[PDB]
């Protein structure tokens, strides 16, 4: 009966990520537009319903204490800035996240055009990226991106909250991280070295052998084993963006998870690293620019918001 937000969707060829911060004293203006979002999605994306326009509304901690009364999600907190040994993961202020995805750029652009002008003057858009998609789902590093997202049962228990928090049954936690990795050192780097970085191959994306794969690789550090033996997986819709006029080539990481402890332990395996391997090899090239922790509610939660405190 709790219908979740469309996070369990395939990767789309175009995507728009909006991190908009809410201005002071503009609470009821966003409280108007928050039930209107699914109406705008069904209004716009029904023009070409075979484009699969799907918005993912997400709300941070500050916007939760401002906008909503009653309960609170249990692990919803501001994104812990990870000041590691060499690489730092910053956290810019962002109240709400609009994650838009469809088959083409225009319908995402029009949904975002109608989104901020349903709450005109209430928000300033802090982060504006138009994430496109490479040839066979690659990123700017050249490796195929996101091939280990689960499906079915191993995905809905990976993302959707059950009754471990029954007031928010259904709903995820989001970690956006806008990277801006350089290509000057990455392109001069040889392929095999880059497979040491990633942990899988580049052309065919075969995972490397367990003894051949180094301990500080990305696919080596990001898989998390529990003590019972099961592995905890997240679903990430990482879409590359970039502007050649500034020479920017970045991959907008965005990870959906049942609890932010899993994503934060992955980020601890990357930035803080393992106690053997204290650095992740992709962070030698990728520097995070933005950061934020958010919460997806259900679409019923946007349909029936709790009253404004």
Give the shortest CB-75-to-a second copy separation in angstroms.
26
Has 228 been annotated as catalytic? no
Give the shortest CB-74-to-a second copy separation in angstroms.
25
User: What is the secondary structure of 252-269 as a DSSP string?
Assistant: EEEEEES-HHHHHHHHII
Q: And the tokens for 56? A: 């993912």
At residue 3, φ and ψ (nearest 5 deg) are: -85, 120
* Interaction residues for ligand HEM, span 187-226 (CB under 6 A): 198, 200, 218-219, 222-223
Give the shortest CB-247-to-ligand HEM separation in angstroms.
17
Q: Check: CB of residue 183 under 8 Å from CB of residue 305.
A: no
Residue window 85-124: x/- pattern of binding to ligand HEM, with contact defined by CB under 6 A: ----------------------------------------
In the list ligand HEM, a second copy, none, the entry touching 155 (Cβ below 5 to 8 angstroms by class) is none
Residue window 46-85: x/- pattern of binding to a second copy, with contact defined by CB under 8 A: xxxx-----------------------------------x
User: What is the secondary structure of 151-215 as a DSSP string?
Assistant: -THHHHHHHS--SSSGGG-S--EEEEEEB---SHHHHHS-HHHHHHHHSB-SSS-PBPPTTTS-T
- Residue 281 binds to ligand HEM (criterion: CB under 6 A): no
Of the chain, the end-to-end C-alpha distance in Å amounts to: 26
Nearer to a second copy, 86 or 162 (CB): 86
- Residue 204 binds to a second copy (criterion: CB under 8 A): yes
Q: And the tokens for 210? A: 């367990």
The C-alpha atoms of residue 205 and residue 199 are separated, in whole angstroms, by: 9
- Residue 137 binds to ligand HEM (criterion: CB under 6 A): no
Catalytic positions, written as ranges: 145
């Amino acid at each position: 009966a709790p219908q979740p937000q469309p996070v369990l969707a395939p990767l789309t060829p175009a995507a728009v990520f909006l991190v908009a911060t809410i201005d002071e004293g503009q609470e009821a203006t966003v409280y108007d537009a928050l039930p209107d979002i699914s109406g705008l999605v069904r209004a716009i994306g029904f023009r070409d319903p075979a484009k699969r326009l799907s918005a993912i509304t997400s709300i941070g901690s500050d916007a939760w204490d401002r906008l909503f009364s009653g309960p609170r999600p249990a692990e919803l907190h501001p994104f812990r800035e990870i000041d590691g040994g060499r690489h730092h993961a910053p956290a810019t202020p962002g109240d709400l996240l609009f994650h838009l995805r469809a088959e083409s750029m225009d319908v995402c652009f029009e949904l975002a055009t109608k989104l901020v002008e349903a709450m005109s003057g209430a928000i300033t858009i802090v982060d504006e990226t138009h994430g496109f998609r490479f040839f066979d789902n690659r990123d700017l590093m050249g490796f195929v991106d996101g091939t280990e997202n689960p499906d079915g049962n191993l995905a809905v228990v990976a993302t959707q909250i059950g009754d471990e928090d029954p007031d928010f049954a259904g709903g995820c936690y989001v970690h956006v991280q806008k990277y801006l990795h350089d290509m000057a050192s990455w392109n001069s780097l040889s392929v095999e070295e880059q497979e040491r970085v990633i942990g899988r191959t580049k052309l065919d994306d075969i995972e490397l052998d367990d003894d051949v794969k180094p301990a500080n690789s990305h696919v080596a550090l990001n898989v998390i084993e529990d003590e019972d033996g099961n592995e905890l997986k997240i679903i990430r819709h990482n879409m590359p963006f970039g502007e050649i006029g500034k020479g920017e080539f970045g991959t907008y990481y965005i990870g959906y998870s049942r609890t932010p402890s899993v994503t934060e332990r992955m980020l601890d395996n990357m930035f803080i690293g393992d106690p053997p391997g204290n650095t992740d090899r992709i962070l030698d090239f990728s520097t995070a620019i933005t950061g934020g922790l958010f919460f997806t509610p259900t679409v019923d939660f946007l349909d029936d918001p709790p009253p404004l405190p």
